[PDB]
Ligand binder design. Structure first.
Ligand SMILES: CCCCCC(=O)Oc1ccc([N+](=O)[O-])cc1
Ligand SMILES: CCCCCC(=O)Oc1ccc([N+](=O)[O-])cc1
Ligand SMILES: CCCCCC(=O)Oc1ccc([N+](=O)[O-])cc1
Ligand SMILES: CCCCCC(=O)Oc1ccc([N+](=O)[O-])cc1
Ligand SMILES: CCCCCC(=O)O
Ligand SMILES: O=[O-]
Lengths: 309, 309, 309, 308
């Protein structure tokens, strides 16, 4: 019934034919390893960049590892992209989204700093948020170790990282970092609770991200349902920064992103809503297996350039 | 209490000091002349263009006058902008929005065809819509008299013209023209009935467009409240073309534009929602008297180039 | 490059930006409406006055509508100002010059009666003169409906109204009313035929009043070039009342006003000649858009008090 | 048949009955003495003023005597610079003294009258040289003047109205420290009267006669092509605001009409006042012809408006 691109359908069929186990059935290490293998299989290769460099910053439970990506060894002051990877706050790391980060850095000609935030179940909510916030504030202070000056920050992330993107914009909005959030890019984010949404039921199985996985992530992360830092649809939107909400039409979390973009319009904030038609959750990281998703990423990039001026 | 830009506030003060009659207290021709004078004395001068020429196309009541604007005398096939002026379907014409049209043509480097559609009270609803639709289909057919080949059409219009923009998009969506609507740009449109909205009461007086003027236009035009050609929030949004909704934060019609953008997100359509802060209705045509509004127009132009790819 | 005040020049640039059809290209109703809109946008607001009352008096073609302005609800006998608006004898009415009339009334502390005389082309020359003369004689008779006794009358008017001012003074000079003309104030009048004059060619375009408009008015009104009621330079100046001639240095009709003042001096009559420097025709009614023209009107007022005196 | 006020006519007939000699039939000093006697019997008495003070200023042929008139010992504003009538041959600071006190009292501005050199002893352009130099001196706000000039107002009757215009033109071509903000030529000689209808119509019997005009002309010997002699020939395009006052029974009436017309032709602001039924010299016969006081008060009211 719902529209699906032919290249996207064949990837869904190949996944079904491979017939892997669920996140529940695997051990934590196996589930984390499976995510690495999926993106390593499915995404386009990393871009070659002048700078791919590990860093770290002070955090509230110790140092936070980071990775800086830049097409330029040396550059003028400008906005710095602060990136938070997807993975339910349970899986993913600096390597699962490495190639995507190099693509953003190459296409934007802006530096990208990815954050290796603490994961659940070892570190439940709000550990991930504390680290993403702290690393973003650190970048915003233009520390000597970053090697370039930030005139503003651009939070961006997929899924759980899209959740972190909005929470960070709201936390910096209430208590500003040294420079402002000049643009946020939540990509298929978890913003409102997906429980009860039509997209969750309609796309519960067979569309890369499953209802089973969502429930697995939620049990490990244990976010407070009433806390805007867990579900930022509940935050104060009246001073939200310029926003690009990107969703996928076949995503169980699609309606969550629709809700957030609508809440921004309701509050009179500038927002670009892009719903990629015929593709699933995780489309930013399957750009070789489903080649048309490269074009979806480039639409987000074009919107980001426009929204930066 | 609401934020107003200093150059915007000085314009409102000059209007307040004048202490003129309402549109209903003038004769019909005096209302129309006062709108010529409003834009004439507040807008920037026309751009010089290679082509500005009057023409006409067949319509169901007779010939529809048009004005072609083009920065180039010769150009290859491409999208053609089809422009519908504001004025409540009662006032305005090809001259009240002429300078803005030359500005759109210059900055977009696309041909613009403005429509001199039939006006109420002489021609009630849906006469304006009939002429806007007929002219847009005519342009989309690449007629010889236009001298330009259309690969797509771009409906755009301010206020009542933004209403016509959405209706034309819905009508061509249901019965396609020779080429598709590739993008629509309703600018502070009337999309839903404003009666009862918070913005109507908050900005009923003192913000250029008044509640009394809205009611004066409504009585003359006589749009059917259940008819999606009168109130296109009622229409089918499931296949709406890519859209840029631009509103003003001080507009009694602001919530109508918010509602339409939210409806597009709800239906999963791609939309850029821009709410210009601290300015009023009509900001596209007061670019000399309120210089900051030139920048507002340029943001719409930048959004348009991005959405055209 | 004649001298133009900066605020005057800003106004002429906005008019040039507006562009649009000439008077002859509009319908008659559109032409009249655009004059309403011009003065409505450009003039200072009406003064508050104790008395603003519509009246009428008998005339040779029927009743003549009138408007009385007075800063006082009751006053003793004294001169009454009888005002005739400009507009080429084709456009204008009691409302186009209403704010100026309240200003004259407020600043002079004298009653003002404005005349709604018959207009061309519907009523050719000398219809406007018939009505201005009849209304001035009526006022001079101290009718009960006026509520104020006149010891004298003070004809005053701008442009075509300044033509009427001189003609009325000459007609009452030949055939006295119940009280004399104690002072006349033709403001940028048409006194001699402007065709062939240096100011007509120098200021034919771009100075509010254009040669095309003068020609449009002439074709509608059809004044006889040998008729002193059409061109009162032709009349007998030997008993002209005390006079204030006000002109504008940028007026195509400037030399006509110069001619009339010279003719009064030649006949040994008392005259104040004031030529406002750096402003155009219509300066009495653009006092908000060109704020320095308020001072020009105040000089005329001071000259009037002096001459009364 | 020309209109003449009753009080003005009584004065002309009493002059007619006296049947005095012409200027040519008198000696030069008899001529000057009779002018003193005319204004002495005919003008209203001097006003009481806080300040009536003789001064002097440098001039191109030696010091120019002056008289300052001020209702106030202490007052910055325009300063009136007055040049007396008398054909450039007769008159002095005393013949017009009472008029000067009246102008100072009614304007509440200071008046500086100029004792310029007279013909035939000093022919044209001596009078103009002194009037110009004194006005420039006043315009510099010298310490000895005792008040500060924000501008100057040249004024004068007849020959002094001629000097009023010439001074305004010379200062217009070469500015003094402050501008001429207003000039008041009173029945001026601006254009050559010979040929004018007014000169013939009023050649005899109206205080100023054709014979007197010729007598003054032969003594002063103004160059007829020189704008400093006949300022109708000057450049009017930047004339200051102007009040031209004339008299309807004046042989020089038409010259004042010509000048006011030339100002209007040039687009300059001008009040033209033509006093009805009185003659030349009405500013100085305000006791013998009491209605001429009202004529002067109209000039005063116009000056206040034009300043204003
Ligand atoms: C095995 C492929 C799916 C990996 C999970 C993923 O692609 O990132 C997510 C982050 C957060 C949530 N969530 O908040 O339910 C869901 C998905
Ligand atoms: C003097 C300002 C009136 C015109 C403002 C304008 O730009 O046009 C419209 C305004 C209101 C509506 N409407 O009530 O739908 C439509 C068009
Ligand atoms: C569009 C503004 C200019 C026309 C109106 C105007 O300027 O008032 C006039 C009245 C009379 C005459 N005339 O008798 O030539 C000219 C002008
Ligand atoms: C004996 C009475 C006449 C005295 C002279 C007079 O009335 O003052 C004049 C000043 C100048 C000129 N002039 O310049 O021809 C004429 C007259
Ligand atoms: C929903 C209306 C269908 C088409 C009506 C029209 O052409 O104006
Ligand atoms: O026009 O309120």
């Amino acid at each position: 019934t719902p529209f699906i691109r032919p290249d996207m359908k064949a990837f869904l069929e190949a996944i079904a034919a491979m017939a892997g186990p669920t996140l529940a059935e695997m051990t934590l290490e196996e589930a984390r390893a499976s995510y690495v293998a999926l993106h390593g299989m499915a995404d386009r290769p990393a871009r070659e960049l002048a700078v791919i460099r590990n860093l770290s910053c002070p955090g509230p439970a110790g140092d936070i590892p980071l990775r800086l990506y830049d097409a330029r060894e040396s550059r003028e002051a400008g906005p710095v992209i602060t990136f938070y990877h997807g993975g339910g706050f349970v899986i993913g790391d600096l390597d699962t989204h490495h190639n995507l980060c190099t693509e953003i850095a190459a296409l934007m000609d802006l530096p990208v700093v990815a954050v290796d935030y603490r994961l659940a179940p070892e570190h439940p909510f709000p550990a991930a948020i504390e680290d993403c916030e702290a690393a973003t504030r650190w970048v915003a202070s233009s520390p000597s170790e970053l090697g370039r000056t930030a005139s503003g920050v651009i939070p961006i992330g997929d899924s759980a990282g899209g959740n972190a993107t909005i929470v960070v914009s709201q936390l910096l909005g209430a208590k500003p970092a040294d420079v402002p959030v000049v643009l946020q890019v939540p990509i298929f984010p978890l913003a409102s609770d997906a429980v009860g949404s039509a997209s969750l039921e309609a796309f519960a199985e067979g569309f890369v991200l499953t209802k089973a996985s969502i429930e697995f992530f939620d049990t490990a992360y244990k976010a407070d349902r009433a806390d805007p830092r867990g579900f930022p649809i509940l935050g104060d939107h009246t001073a939200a920064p310029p926003t690009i909400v990107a969703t996928a039409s076949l995503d169980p979390l699609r309606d969550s992103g629709r809700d957030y973009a609508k809440a921004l319009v309701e509050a009179g904030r500038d927002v670009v809503y892009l719903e990629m038609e015929g593709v699933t959750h995780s489309f930013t990281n399957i750009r070789a297996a489903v080649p048309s998703t490269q074009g979806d990423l480039e639409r987000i990039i074009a919107a980001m350039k426009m929204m930066l001026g």
